[PDB]
Amino acid sequence: TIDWEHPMFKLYEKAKRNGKWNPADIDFSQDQKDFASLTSEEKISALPLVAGFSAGEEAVTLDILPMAHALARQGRLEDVLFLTTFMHDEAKHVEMFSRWQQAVGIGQMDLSVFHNDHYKRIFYEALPEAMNRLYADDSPEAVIRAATVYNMIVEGTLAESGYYTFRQIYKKAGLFPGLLQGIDYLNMDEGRHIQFGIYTIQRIVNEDERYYELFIRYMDELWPHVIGYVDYLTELGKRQQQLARTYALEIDYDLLRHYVIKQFNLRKKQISRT
Amino acid sequence: TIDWEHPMFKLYEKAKRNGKWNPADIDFSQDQKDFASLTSEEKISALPLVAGFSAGEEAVTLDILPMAHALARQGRLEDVLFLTTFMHDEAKHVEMFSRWQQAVGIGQMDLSVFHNDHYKRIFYEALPEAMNRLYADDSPEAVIRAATVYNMIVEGTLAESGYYTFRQIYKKAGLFPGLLQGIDYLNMDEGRHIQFGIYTIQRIVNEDERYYELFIRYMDELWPHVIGYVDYLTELGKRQQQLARTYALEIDYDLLRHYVIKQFNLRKKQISRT
Ligand SMILES: CCCCCCCCCCCCCCCC(=O)O
Ligand SMILES: CCCCCCCCCCCCCCCC(=O)O
Ligand SMILES: [Mn+2]
Ligand SMILES: [Mn+2]
Ligand SMILES: [Mn+2]
Ligand SMILES: [Mn+2]
Ligand SMILES: [Mn+2]
Ligand SMILES: [Mn+2]
């Protein structure tokens, strides 16, 4: 039947209760004015972080499907019910960033230019490969790896840090209130996504504590590309300093960096070896 | 980007606006009392139609995924955004029937007994085979067949007729107000599902009017099992006449039957050869 007490059924219920926001309701009119008011140099200072996210959301909307397939095939009905909310969330995320991009005029703008090699390695290689694998290989190893790259690294490390960074910068400056409303909603959805990942990894580790070592290993395997992208954005911003100056933000890249590091280690700690 | 004018983006927007209902909010307390008040013979008279639906909703929640995969792989982003709402709708449908079944006490009850051979041929063979095919064969032929069996026959013919039948019987009788609230919501969701099917078949026919003949052919191929199930339910009810008598319903199986026939032909007519 439905196991009403199943953790993923409970997460499904919360998703319905907490998932009513609609990107079509966000007022982006002030964002349009803010963006127009920026200098050409101030404009470029913002784009790298938006590039990472818009492309990232698109990647994950296509790439969660194989997990829903694999779990369906295993008969995990409550997981599948929850995953329908996960996939619809990601749809709204793609929608929200595309609306912002249109409202402020950079819809055309090929933002690919802000994706370095480490980024592409995560979003264009490790992520799609690990998810697609599940179509032919739904072994515990395969499922742990998919949840690690997608939920623990892409969402749980990069996206979390991305949200924090957005707040740290533009919330201070009083800029882009529509986008920040969007990001708050995104960040609320993402908490459920991460919880799914934790639950999935933990139940597999609960069967064989040796999958714990596999989890840690896959996390450390990805870390170089995580930090390598983070260094490239850090670096990139330190050149284009004009938005920080104009808006009186000592943009502390060294504390962001450690927020990333903090997120990575925190995700490890949410998986228990025993 | 997102093509804001795309028909499936517009259907996605409507789904969000019109898709807020939550099965967890439905009051089933009166349904519990109604069901308990029924005689043992009256109880059995209702179950066949509920059997068809609960199993049917479960089938379609698992079975829409390959279509979302195939269209994603073709780069039809707006279709995929809409399909996230379609899949979440089906989740709530499975949820709604399981809640009703629990509330009135038939959760255990193996309702498989009311699935005859024609039913199994649709839901356990033709439907999963046609959807799963899309994982390895996303040809126009394959996509038309998937949309025909799923959207035009299962939803557009059987489910539509099932809703009508539910209303005709229990709405008259003043019974099962919770279930009927649920069914109204379901039926509103299903209109978008059918519209997706029409759009999908029509855009493929628009490229080669010879796919029109393929559409009609696949519809007629399934008709025998549609009517054969409908005859078995018709037949089945005519024996167990006690609920009709008790509640003063001349249950007109001959008009239902023609409602089914009417639905089938109506679906053909929504696809234009030209
Ligand atoms: C000092 C800079 C550190 C900040 C790191 C920036 C992270 C931006 C990358 C965006 C990835 C978004 C993917 C989210 C996927 C989802 O929504 O499930
Ligand atoms: C005289 C009897 C005719 C009535 C026909 C009864 C139809 C019951 C079958 C239920 C199928 C439900 C599947 C719906 C799938 C979806 O929700 O997309
Ligand atoms: Mn997201
Ligand atoms: Mn996410
Ligand atoms: Mn490097
Ligand atoms: Mn349904
Ligand atoms: Mn449907
Ligand atoms: Mn027969």
The domain that holds B88 is classified in CATH as 1.10.620.20
Amino acid identity of A179?
L
Minimal Cα distance from B109: which residue of A?
A: A1
Q: What share of chain A is helix, strand, coil (3-state, %, to 5)?
A: 80, 0, 20
Q: Which amino acid is present at A122?
A: I
Count of structural domains within chain B: 1
- Full DSSP string of A171-216: IHHT--HHHHHHHHHHHHHHHHHHHHHHHHHHHHHTT-THHHHHHH
| Ranges assigned E (strand) in B67-215 | none
**Gap between the Cα atoms of B71 and A106, Å rounded:** 27
Q: Show Cβ contacts of residue A79 under 8 Å, excluding neighbours closer than 6 positions.
A: A8, A71, A196, A200
Resolution reached, in Å? Answer: 2.0
- B43, B103 in Cβ contact below 8 A? no
The encoded tokens of residue A18 equal 């907490």
The residues, ordered by sequence, that sit 6+ positions from B58 with a Cβ below 8 Å of its Cβ are: A77, B94
Check: CB of residue B59 under 8 Å from CB of residue B97: no
**In this structure, how many other beta carbons lie within 10 angstroms of the beta carbon of residue A210?**
10
Rounded to an integer, what distance in angstroms lies between the CA atom of residue A176 and that of residue A30?
7
8 Å CB contact of B80 and A90: no
**Ramachandran bin of A105, using left for φ above 0, alpha for ψ from -120 to 50, beta for the remaining angles:** left
Give the integer Cα–Cα distance in Å for B209 and B188: 31
Contacts of A94 in chain B (CB under 8 A): 2, 77, 81
Contact B73, B83 (CB under 8 A): no
Q: Which two tokens stand for residue B23?
A: 């099965």
> What is the distance in A from the centroid of ligand 8 to the CA of B118?
7
Inter-axis angle of helices B177-205 and B140-147, to 10 degrees?
A: 160
Q: Which domain holds residue A207?
A: 1-274
C-alpha B155 – ligand 7 centre gap (Å): 6
Q: How many CB atoms lie under 10 A from the CB of residue A74?
A: 12
Give the three-state DSSP class for B272: coil
In the PDB record, what is the listed experimental method? Answer: X-ray
> What tokens does B101 get?
């079944």
Q: Which residue of B has its CA nearest to A135?
A: B135
The DSSP element (H or E) to which A59 belongs, if any, is helix A40-63
| Cα separation, B162 vs B183, whole angstroms | 10
